[PDB]
Amino acid sequence: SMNPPPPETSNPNKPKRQTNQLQYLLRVVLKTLWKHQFAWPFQQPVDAVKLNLPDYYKIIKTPMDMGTIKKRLENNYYWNAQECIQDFNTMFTNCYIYNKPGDDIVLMAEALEKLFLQKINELPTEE
Ligand SMILES: Cc1cc2c(-c3ccco3)cnc(N[C@@H]3CCN(C)C[C@H]3C(=O)NC3CCCCC3)c2[nH]c1=O
């Protein structure tokens, strides 16, 4: 029971939608970040057990990762792009909170966040 349940990636009670913005988030934004050399620690929930970070889920109570975001986008979990943008920002913020300055995971998150902001800068207008 050492790791928490992951964030939900489906919910039969949550209304679902496709928008051009959510298609762009999957096809352009997530695709760009996912194949980056720094993506791999962010491609699934933090395994606090295997990594021996027992305080991770004592400190981080709103976990998020690109594995979860990928499944949410694939499952049409989101109603709008802003929900998905908030998930990316949660993932980056958690990294900046939990880790100390000089930690390479912070420099990796900063590089992914810079690329994230470049890609969402041209988020297309809603059709
Ligand atoms: C999201 C997340 C993941 C993560 C992972 C990981 C690796 C595979 C999956 O997850 C490892 N270590 C972390 N923190 C380290 C804590 C100890 N300091 C000294 C170095 C810290 C550090 O910078 N570690 C990195 C991990 C990636 C390779 C370079 C070293 C992580 N912190 C995070 O917020």
Side-chain angles (χ1 to χ4, degrees):
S1 78
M2 301 261 306
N3 290 312
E8 71 178 27
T9 55
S10 67
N11 187 333
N13 292 123
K14 186 177 193 296
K16 45 184 176 174
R17 199 162 65 146
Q18 295 190 214
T19 68
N20 63 320
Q21 293 191 324
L22 285 163
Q23 288 182 308
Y24 179 90
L25 273 162
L26 179 55
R27 292 164 180 174
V28 178
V29 180
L30 180 67
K31 186 47 178 187
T32 295
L33 292 218
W34 188 269
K35 298 307 295 178
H36 195 273
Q37 62 268 26
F38 294 163
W40 59 273
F42 303 97
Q43 281 176 336
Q44 59 286 311
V46 168
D47 190 343
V49 184
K50 273 209 214 165
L51 295 168
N52 192 24
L53 301 175
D55 65 342
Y56 188 80
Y57 290 112
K58 305 193 205 291
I59 295 165
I60 301 304
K61 299 306 197 180
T62 70
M64 188 51 58
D65 65 277
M66 297 200 291
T68 299
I69 292 166
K70 178 166 180 294
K71 289 176 183 300
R72 285 181 173 190
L73 289 165
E74 284 173 346
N75 295 343
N76 303 302
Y77 176 86
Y78 300 118
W79 189 260
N80 66 44
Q82 286 306 329
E83 290 177 83
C84 180
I85 292 167
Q86 286 165 23
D87 282 347
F88 276 101
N89 287 147
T90 296
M91 179 181 76
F92 295 133
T93 299
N94 293 339
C95 187
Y96 304 144
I97 292 174
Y98 176 73
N99 303 281
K100 69 161 199 166
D103 282 351
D104 283 335
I105 195 71
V106 172
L107 293 170
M108 290 163 81
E110 280 174 345
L112 291 173
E113 183 177 20
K114 186 180 166 184
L115 185 54
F116 170 71
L117 288 175
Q118 290 180 135
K119 292 310 188 192
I120 69 160
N121 191 57
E122 298 198 19
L123 188 73
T125 306
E126 298 189 51
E127 291 181 21

PDB file of all heavy atoms in Angstrom, residues 14 31 46 60 65-66 82 106 116 124:
ATOM      1  N   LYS A  14     -18.117  12.026 -15.092  1.00  0.00           N
ATOM      2  CA  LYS A  14     -17.509  13.295 -15.574  1.00  0.00           C
ATOM      3  C   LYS A  14     -17.817  13.482 -17.056  1.00  0.00           C
ATOM      4  O   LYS A  14     -17.398  12.668 -17.884  1.00  0.00           O
ATOM      5  CB  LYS A  14     -15.999  13.298 -15.324  1.00  0.00           C
ATOM      6  CG  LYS A  14     -15.303  14.613 -15.643  1.00  0.00           C
ATOM      7  CD  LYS A  14     -13.825  14.615 -15.331  1.00  0.00           C
ATOM      8  CE  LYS A  14     -13.215  16.000 -15.351  1.00  0.00           C
ATOM      9  NZ  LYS A  14     -13.286  16.609 -16.699  1.00  0.00           N
ATOM     10  N   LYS A  31       2.996  15.333 -27.208  1.00  0.00           N
ATOM     11  CA  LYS A  31       3.869  14.548 -28.122  1.00  0.00           C
ATOM     12  C   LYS A  31       5.301  15.092 -28.041  1.00  0.00           C
ATOM     13  O   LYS A  31       6.229  14.268 -27.899  1.00  0.00           O
ATOM     14  CB  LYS A  31       3.338  14.561 -29.558  1.00  0.00           C
ATOM     15  CG  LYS A  31       4.100  13.660 -30.525  1.00  0.00           C
ATOM     16  CD  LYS A  31       4.357  12.260 -29.996  1.00  0.00           C
ATOM     17  CE  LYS A  31       5.069  11.371 -30.994  1.00  0.00           C
ATOM     18  NZ  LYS A  31       5.179   9.966 -30.533  1.00  0.00           N
ATOM     19  N   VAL A  46       5.116   9.121  -9.704  1.00  0.00           N
ATOM     20  CA  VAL A  46       6.321   8.900  -8.857  1.00  0.00           C
ATOM     21  C   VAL A  46       6.088   7.611  -8.062  1.00  0.00           C
ATOM     22  O   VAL A  46       5.119   7.563  -7.267  1.00  0.00           O
ATOM     23  CB  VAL A  46       6.603  10.102  -7.937  1.00  0.00           C
ATOM     24  CG1 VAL A  46       7.629   9.766  -6.872  1.00  0.00           C
ATOM     25  CG2 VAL A  46       7.032  11.327  -8.728  1.00  0.00           C
ATOM     26  N   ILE A  60       3.537  15.780  -1.163  1.00  0.00           N
ATOM     27  CA  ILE A  60       2.770  16.014  -2.421  1.00  0.00           C
ATOM     28  C   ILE A  60       1.404  15.327  -2.305  1.00  0.00           C
ATOM     29  O   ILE A  60       1.349  14.092  -2.363  1.00  0.00           O
ATOM     30  CB  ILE A  60       3.582  15.531  -3.637  1.00  0.00           C
ATOM     31  CG1 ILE A  60       4.926  16.258  -3.736  1.00  0.00           C
ATOM     32  CG2 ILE A  60       2.770  15.665  -4.917  1.00  0.00           C
ATOM     33  CD1 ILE A  60       4.820  17.772  -3.784  1.00  0.00           C
ATOM     34  N   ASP A  65       1.431  13.663 -13.413  1.00  0.00           N
ATOM     35  CA  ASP A  65       2.525  13.194 -14.292  1.00  0.00           C
ATOM     36  C   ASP A  65       1.983  13.150 -15.722  1.00  0.00           C
ATOM     37  O   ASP A  65       0.750  13.198 -15.887  1.00  0.00           O
ATOM     38  CB  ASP A  65       3.011  11.826 -13.817  1.00  0.00           C
ATOM     39  CG  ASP A  65       1.934  10.769 -13.966  1.00  0.00           C
ATOM     40  OD1 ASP A  65       1.075  10.671 -13.054  1.00  0.00           O
ATOM     41  OD2 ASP A  65       1.921  10.100 -15.028  1.00  0.00           O
ATOM     42  N   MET A  66       2.869  13.049 -16.715  1.00  0.00           N
ATOM     43  CA  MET A  66       2.470  13.031 -18.145  1.00  0.00           C
ATOM     44  C   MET A  66       1.843  11.684 -18.524  1.00  0.00           C
ATOM     45  O   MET A  66       1.068  11.676 -19.477  1.00  0.00           O
ATOM     46  CB  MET A  66       3.656  13.330 -19.066  1.00  0.00           C
ATOM     47  CG  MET A  66       4.217  14.714 -18.836  1.00  0.00           C
ATOM     48  SD  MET A  66       5.198  15.297 -20.241  1.00  0.00           S
ATOM     49  CE  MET A  66       6.602  14.192 -20.117  1.00  0.00           C
ATOM     50  N   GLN A  82      -7.981  23.984 -20.513  1.00  0.00           N
ATOM     51  CA  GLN A  82      -7.519  24.611 -19.244  1.00  0.00           C
ATOM     52  C   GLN A  82      -7.325  23.538 -18.165  1.00  0.00           C
ATOM     53  O   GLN A  82      -6.354  23.657 -17.398  1.00  0.00           O
ATOM     54  CB  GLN A  82      -8.494  25.698 -18.780  1.00  0.00           C
ATOM     55  CG  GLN A  82      -8.408  26.978 -19.600  1.00  0.00           C
ATOM     56  CD  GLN A  82      -7.009  27.542 -19.679  1.00  0.00           C
ATOM     57  OE1 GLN A  82      -6.197  27.392 -18.763  1.00  0.00           O
ATOM     58  NE2 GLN A  82      -6.715  28.200 -20.790  1.00  0.00           N
ATOM     59  N   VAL A 106      14.833  19.245 -11.121  1.00  0.00           N
ATOM     60  CA  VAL A 106      14.306  20.640 -11.194  1.00  0.00           C
ATOM     61  C   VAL A 106      14.718  21.250 -12.538  1.00  0.00           C
ATOM     62  O   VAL A 106      13.844  21.835 -13.204  1.00  0.00           O
ATOM     63  CB  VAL A 106      14.770  21.499 -10.001  1.00  0.00           C
ATOM     64  CG1 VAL A 106      14.396  22.964 -10.164  1.00  0.00           C
ATOM     65  CG2 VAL A 106      14.225  20.956  -8.688  1.00  0.00           C
ATOM     66  N   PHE A 116       7.012  23.413 -22.903  1.00  0.00           N
ATOM     67  CA  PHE A 116       5.540  23.393 -22.694  1.00  0.00           C
ATOM     68  C   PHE A 116       4.979  24.778 -23.041  1.00  0.00           C
ATOM     69  O   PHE A 116       4.018  24.854 -23.815  1.00  0.00           O
ATOM     70  CB  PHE A 116       5.194  22.975 -21.263  1.00  0.00           C
ATOM     71  CG  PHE A 116       3.742  23.155 -20.894  1.00  0.00           C
ATOM     72  CD1 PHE A 116       2.769  22.328 -21.435  1.00  0.00           C
ATOM     73  CD2 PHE A 116       3.350  24.152 -20.012  1.00  0.00           C
ATOM     74  CE1 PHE A 116       1.434  22.498 -21.106  1.00  0.00           C
ATOM     75  CE2 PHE A 116       2.012  24.317 -19.678  1.00  0.00           C
ATOM     76  CZ  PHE A 116       1.060  23.493 -20.230  1.00  0.00           C
ATOM     77  N   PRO A 124      -4.416  26.823 -30.478  1.00  0.00           N
ATOM     78  CA  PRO A 124      -5.298  27.378 -31.503  1.00  0.00           C
ATOM     79  C   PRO A 124      -6.629  27.842 -30.894  1.00  0.00           C
ATOM     80  O   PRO A 124      -7.022  27.305 -29.874  1.00  0.00           O
ATOM     81  CB  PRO A 124      -5.500  26.216 -32.489  1.00  0.00           C
ATOM     82  CG  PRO A 124      -5.294  24.975 -31.646  1.00  0.00           C
ATOM     83  CD  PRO A 124      -4.253  25.368 -30.617  1.00  0.00           C
TER      84      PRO A 124
END
